[PDB]
Amino acid sequence: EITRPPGVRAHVGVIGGSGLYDPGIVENPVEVKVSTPYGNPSDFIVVGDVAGVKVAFLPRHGRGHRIPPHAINYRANIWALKALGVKWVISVSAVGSLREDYRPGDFVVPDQFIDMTKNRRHYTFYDGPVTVHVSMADPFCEDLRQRLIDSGRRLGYTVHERGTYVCIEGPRFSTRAESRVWKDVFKADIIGMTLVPEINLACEAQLCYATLAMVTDYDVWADRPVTAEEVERVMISNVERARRMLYDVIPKLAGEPELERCSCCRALDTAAI
Amino acid sequence: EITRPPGVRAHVGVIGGSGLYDPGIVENPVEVKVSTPYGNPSDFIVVGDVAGVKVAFLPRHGRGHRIPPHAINYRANIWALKALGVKWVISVSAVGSLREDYRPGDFVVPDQFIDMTKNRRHYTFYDGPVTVHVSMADPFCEDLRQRLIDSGRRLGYTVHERGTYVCIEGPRFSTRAESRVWKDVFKADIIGMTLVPEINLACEAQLCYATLAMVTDYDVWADRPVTAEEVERVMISNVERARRMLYDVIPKLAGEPELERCSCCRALDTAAI
Amino acid sequence: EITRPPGVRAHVGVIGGSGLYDPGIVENPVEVKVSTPYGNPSDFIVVGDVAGVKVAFLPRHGRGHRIPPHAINYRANIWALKALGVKWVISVSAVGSLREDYRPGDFVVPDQFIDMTKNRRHYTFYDGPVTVHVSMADPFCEDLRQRLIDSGRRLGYTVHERGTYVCIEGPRFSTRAESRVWKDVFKADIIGMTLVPEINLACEAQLCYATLAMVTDYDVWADRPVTAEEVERVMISNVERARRMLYDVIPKLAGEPELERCSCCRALDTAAI
Numbered sequence: 157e158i159t160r161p162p163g164v165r166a167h168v169g170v171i172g173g174s175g176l177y178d179p180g181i182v183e184n185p186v187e188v189k190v191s192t193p194y195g196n197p198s199d200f201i202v203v204g205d206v207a208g209v210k211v212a213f214l215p216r217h218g219r220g221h222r223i224p225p226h227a228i229n230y231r232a233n234i235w236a237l238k239a240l241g242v243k244w245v246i247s248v249s250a251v252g253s254l255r256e257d258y259r260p261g262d263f264v265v266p267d268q269f270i271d272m273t274k275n276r277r278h279y280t281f282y283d284g285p286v287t288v289h290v291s292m293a294d295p296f297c298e299d300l301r302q303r304l305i306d307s308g309r310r311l312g313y314t315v316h317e318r319g320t321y322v323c324i325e326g327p328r329f330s331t332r333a334e335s336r337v338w339k340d341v342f343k344a345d346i347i348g349m350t351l352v353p354e355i356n357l358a359c360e361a362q363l364c365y366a367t368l369a370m371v372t373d374y375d376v377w378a379d380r381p382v383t384a385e386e387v388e389r390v391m392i393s394n395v396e397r398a399r400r401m402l403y404d405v406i407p408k409l410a411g412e413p414e415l416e417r418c419s420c421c422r423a424l425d426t427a428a429i
Numbered sequence: 430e431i432t433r434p435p436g437v438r439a440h441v442g443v444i445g446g447s448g449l450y451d452p453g454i455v456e457n458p459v460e461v462k463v464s465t466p467y468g469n470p471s472d473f474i475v476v477g478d479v480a481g482v483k484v485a486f487l488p489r490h491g492r493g494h495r496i497p498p499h500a501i502n503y504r505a506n507i508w509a510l511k512a513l514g515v516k517w518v519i520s521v522s523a524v525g526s527l528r529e530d531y532r533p534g535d536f537v538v539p540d541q542f543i544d545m546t547k548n549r550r551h552y553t554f555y556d557g558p559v560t561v562h563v564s565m566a567d568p569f570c571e572d573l574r575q576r577l578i579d580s581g582r583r584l585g586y587t588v589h590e591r592g593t594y595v596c597i598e599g600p601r602f603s604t605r606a607e608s609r610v611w612k613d614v615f616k617a618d619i620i621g622m623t624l625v626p627e628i629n630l631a632c633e634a635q636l637c638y639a640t641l642a643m644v645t646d647y648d649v650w651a652d653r654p655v656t657a658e659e660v661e662r663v664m665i666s667n668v669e670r671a672r673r674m675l676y677d678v679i680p681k682l683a684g685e686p687e688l689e690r691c692s693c694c695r696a697l698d699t700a701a702i
Numbered sequence: 703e704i705t706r707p708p709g710v711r712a713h714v715g716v717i718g719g720s721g722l723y724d725p726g727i728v729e730n731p732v733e734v735k736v737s738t739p740y741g742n743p744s745d746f747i748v749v750g751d752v753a754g755v756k757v758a759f760l761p762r763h764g765r766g767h768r769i770p771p772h773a774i775n776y777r778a779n780i781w782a783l784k785a786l787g788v789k790w791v792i793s794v795s796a797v798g799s800l801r802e803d804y805r806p807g808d809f810v811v812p813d814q815f816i817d818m819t820k821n822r823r824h825y826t827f828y829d830g831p832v833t834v835h836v837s838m839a840d841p842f843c844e845d846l847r848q849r850l851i852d853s854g855r856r857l858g859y860t861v862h863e864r865g866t867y868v869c870i871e872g873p874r875f876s877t878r879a880e881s882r883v884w885k886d887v888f889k890a891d892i893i894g895m896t897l898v899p900e901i902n903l904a905c906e907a908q909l910c911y912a913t914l915a916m917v918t919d920y921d922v923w924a925d926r927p928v929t930a931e932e933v934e935r936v937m938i939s940n941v942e943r944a945r946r947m948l949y950d951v952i953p954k955l956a957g958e959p960e961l962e963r964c965s966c967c968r969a970l971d972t973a974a975i
């Protein structure tokens with residue numbers, strides 16, 4: 157693919173808030189434009205070096221939080237990261253909690269999801285003539301999941317070691333009746349808006365993708381229901397711990413994901429017809 | 430600031446003997462001239478990469494040990510390192526011991542100091558119109574202190590985990606009556622000449638600064654009093670172990686100091702009037 | 703020495719199969735031509751960055767396995783690596799086993815060897831007028847040996863922590879009568895063809911050289927004798943584990959070999975007459 161500047165490559169993708177990028181850490185940073193067949197990624201991708209590992213930072217909402225979950229160009233974002241050569245993708249996300257013990261401030265590394273989105277327009281890169289049906293029974297990359305969990309232990313942070321993420325459409329938050337269904341009927345653990353189709357596309361791109369979620373609220377279940385202001389307040393309060401995990405994890409990603417602990421790394425071998 | 434070559438940046442500063450720099454380790458080294466408002470730093474600063482971390486080496490005495498402690502341009506040295514963008518500063522220093530159990534050859538990572546210098550001419554960057562009074566109750570950066578101690582453990586070296594450094598003016602060594610005061614009255618543990626005002630300035634520059642001291646002698650207290658030849662002999666005999674600690678520590682400094690374990694990292698927030 | 707491109711340097715050499723090099727890991731790779739007084743190394747040396755450590759990859763048999771053990775330009779290979787500035791050399795090798803418990807698939811980090819080659823033409827760089835006789839009582843670099851063993855532990859792989867490598871001339875495999883001598887009379891543990899004079903030369907070049915061997919067969923001792931096809935099949939089946947060890951080890955080699963655990967690092971101090 158064509159990039160400007162030309163010849164830019166990266167090994168680890170980081171998708172999350174723009175505040176995750178730290179210019180006091182990232183060496184030789186460059187803003188890069190990566191052509192995609194889907195138009196513009198959410199913003200410039202910043203490529204630079206962390207402990208000799210080339211990292212590509214992409215704020216999914218854009219800098220300044222300009223793009224709500226439903227309006228994100230998921231195809232452009234994942235195509236651009238794949239085009240740069242990334243093998244690992246760390247997503248960092250805010251989520252609501254549907255269980256007491258997943259408390260605001262806790263990290264969660266989910267292992268499952270339930271897609272309840274409706275309006276994302278494309279849930280795949282493959283519209284024909286090659287039909288592709290990737291197996292997403294175990295949709296996250298286990299190698300990266302365990303690395304995120306390990307970093308949490310090293311740093312003394314609470315990181316819940318499993319969880320089912322119900323992805324809703326939004327942008328409005330759940331009603332109480334919907335939340336009762338997510339919590340009591342589907343038995344989901346956390347709730348967010350951006351996981352799908354981001355993870356679908358990452359899997360189709362044969363990336364090792366895992367999510368580091370930060371609980372920001374209890375959705376409808378506390379005395380006062382979740383608000384946008386509450387979510388953003390808790391995220392900004394905890395972004396420093398998110399960065400510490402991120403910059404602890406990245407230096408250990410110089411190598412490749414272990415294929416037998418990366419469900420999607422060879423997804424296309426048996427997915428295409 | 431203006432540098433030659435231009436655009437040089439660094440993340441970790443190393444202040445100590447020129448023998449600490451190892452061209453067999455440091456990748457892409459460049460000698461850099463960093464303008465300061467105080468004139469020349471002690472020598473060229475050599476910037477290069479250690480395990481993907483950009484390090485700036487500055488010999489405080491100059492190459493060849495040309496500059497005694499009292500003649501060092503402390504302001505130029507710290508300004509130049511800060512101007513390059515460093516966040517961490519590892520100082521490596523020779524010190525005398527005032528206690529039997531801090532033996533020649535032992536490393537010491539001090540946590541306190543007593544300033545008994547008199548002739549250093551500037552003890553601060555701030556002469557007005559903004560008055561700055563940094564809190565130096567806990568003057569060293571705890572994050573870096575514990576990292577130096579940890580490396581010592583990994584390598585099997587003795588590293589005393591605390592100590593009070595009495596900084597004297599010199600260049601002449603202490604009389605017996607002075608040493609009795611340092612040891613028995615002030616209850617200092619080690620003695621050197623270069624800590625102040627280097628640490629003051631580093632703190633004002635909002636750097637995470639810690640000292641790795643190497644005991645070279647027992648000042649007046651052994652049968653034969655300390656001499657310059659003795660200090661230099663023990664330092665050169667132990668410089669290889671100093672390097673091993675240095676190159677063990679640096680690769681783990683890709684990230685930022687933890688603010689809550691870095692007393693000076695936000696010193697200016699409440700220090701300026 | 704003259705290189706094309708000019709000014710290329712490296713810190714760690716990797717000698718083994720071309721399949722060890724992974725373009726998904728190695729940053730900023732460049733093929734480099736390094737002049738030697740002995741003509742062409744086995745192939746281009748690929749220099750690039752792994753976790754900020756500069757690595758030089760050299761396939762001893764050439765890409766495509768074009769050069770049998772007896773035809774390898776050992777002097778050119780080691781001269782070229784030394785000329786680039788490497789301090790560490792990791793050799794990865796296939797070997798036969800002469801003992802039940804060194805099983806196909808197991809790694810072995812040998813500590814000794816017995817040279818039974820005959821036709822390698824030069825066993826040294828030093829033909830006069832400076833006579834050089836390096837001590838090779840303990841011919842491998844202990845620092846690197848223990849690092850290879852440590853990586854094996856971290857990864858959960860079997861790595862035998864000692865072994866005597868009998869190096870035969872080849873290219874034909876041993877007869878049964880020869881194998882009985884290696885196994886029962888010399889009491890060797892593993893057998894290969896490429897160790898000598900590669901290790902001699904590395905030692906004379908004052909490199910920290912260690913071998914990570916992979917058992918591929920039991921030479922004559924199983925029901926069916928070893929064949930070339932069998933060796934290559936087991937190697938290709940296990941190359942991924944070899945890579946995982948290699949890319950686990952390399953990031954920890956930013957520093958220098960420890961002289962007191964590197965028998966050859968100062969070999970020339972007392973070897974030359």
Ligand SMILES: Nc1ncnc2[nH]cnc12
Pocket residue numbers: 250251252253324329330347348349372373374375376382387
């Ligand atoms: N309660 C919630 N519902 C949906 N998305 C969220 N993101 C953060 N909290 C959320």
Ligand SMILES: Nc1ncnc2[nH]cnc12
Pocket residue numbers: 523524525526597602603620621622645646647648649655660
């Ligand atoms: N005894 C001593 N007094 C002052 N500075 C020193 N540096 C090393 N040893 C010393």
Ligand SMILES: Nc1ncnc2[nH]cnc12
Pocket residue numbers: 796797798799870875876893894895918919920921922928933
């Ligand atoms: N049995 C064997 N003999 C010699 N070299 C070998 N390399 C691998 N297996 C071998």
